[PDB]
Homo-oligomer: A and B are copies of this chain.
Amino acid sequence: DRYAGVLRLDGKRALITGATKGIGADIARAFAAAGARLVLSGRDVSELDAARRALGEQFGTDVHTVAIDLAEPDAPAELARRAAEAFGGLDVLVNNAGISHPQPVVDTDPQLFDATIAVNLRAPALLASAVGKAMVAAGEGGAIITVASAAALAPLPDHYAYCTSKAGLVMATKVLARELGPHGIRANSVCPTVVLTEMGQRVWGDEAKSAPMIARIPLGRFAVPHEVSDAVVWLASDAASMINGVDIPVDGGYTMG
């Protein structure tokens, strides 16, 4: 997965959330490789510093970091603004967030439900509406890519809150697609199955726990992170100039059922 010709994003101004762990870090690394200028947000200052250092020396990338928790008061509006300001505008948002508190539906805990809605649905939704407003005012079109899940698309045991949150965000994405489309802004989601990030391996590593999952994936395996990143780079590029309002599963045929 190297990015050249139409998959270059030289000079494109991209905010990427949860940029220092798992999927986010890999989309950040892809975008750096592809020539992007990056605003990277996250909860850990030193991870953000490592990230600036690494992507700078490895790709010469123009990187500005924002250490913020998107659950802090007014964080979506604050992060949107700071990000637009970093380079005089945003051309891309990668809306990346994810917690998961798995539980039988009969045992759903209200606190864990709410936490999951807060982090997976509320903050990404309001970051996107704010970013989108600034995209509309600036008049240079743009792209918004939601990192959702196959769980947005097909229900999963012990994933009541998770599934619920991701399915809502996905619909949130389509409203953006619908209203911001006429301004040349394109909003689409990527919907991965399990991704073998460090955390992914730790949680889905057991053969017999993951076996039922795998047997529902025709290609017979889980995703690796660069596969998600590929799809995001494509959606950001001019190779997706007509693509709007679409959910791309990265799931080896899982969601066909």
Contact = CB atoms under 8 A, between A and B. Distances in A.
Interface of A: 1-7, 73-74, 76-77, 104-108, 110, 113-114, 117, 121-122, 125-126, 129, 132-133, 136, 152-161, 163-172, 174-182, 184, 186, 192-193, 216-220, 223-224, 227, 230-231, 233-234, 238-246, 248-257
Contacts of A239: 1, 7, 230-231, 233-234
Given A73-B110, A167-B170, A250-B242, A3 B1 contact: no
- Complex A-B, nearest 8 residue pairs according to Cβ-Cβ distance, in ascending order: A181-B218, A257-B257, A167-B171, A168-B168, A4-B5, A4-B4, A2-B5, A245-B253
A126 B1 CA distance: 33
A170 B66 CA distance: 34
A254 B238 CA distance: 19
Nearest to A229: B239
A256 B177 contact: yes
Of listed A2, A104, A168, A186, residue having the most chain B CB within 10 A? A168
A249 B174 CA distance: 13
B171 A104 contact: no
Contacts of A106: 129, 132-133, 136, 179-180
B182 A218 contact: yes
A250 B234 CA distance: 13
Contacts of A160: 125, 129, 172, 175-176, 179
26 contacts: A1-B6, A4-B4, A4-B7, A7-B239, A74-B110, A113-B125, A117-B122, A125-B160, A154-B257, A155-B257, A160-B179, A164-B169, A164-B171, A174-B256, A181-B253, A182-B219, A193-B242, A227-B241, A231-B243, A234-B234, A242-B251, A244-B252, A245-B255, A246-B249, A256-B257, A257-B257
Nearest to A159: B175
Of listed A1, A164, A166, A186, residue having the most chain B CB within 10 A? A164
A168 B175 contact: no
Contact of A252 (B132, B167, B242): B242
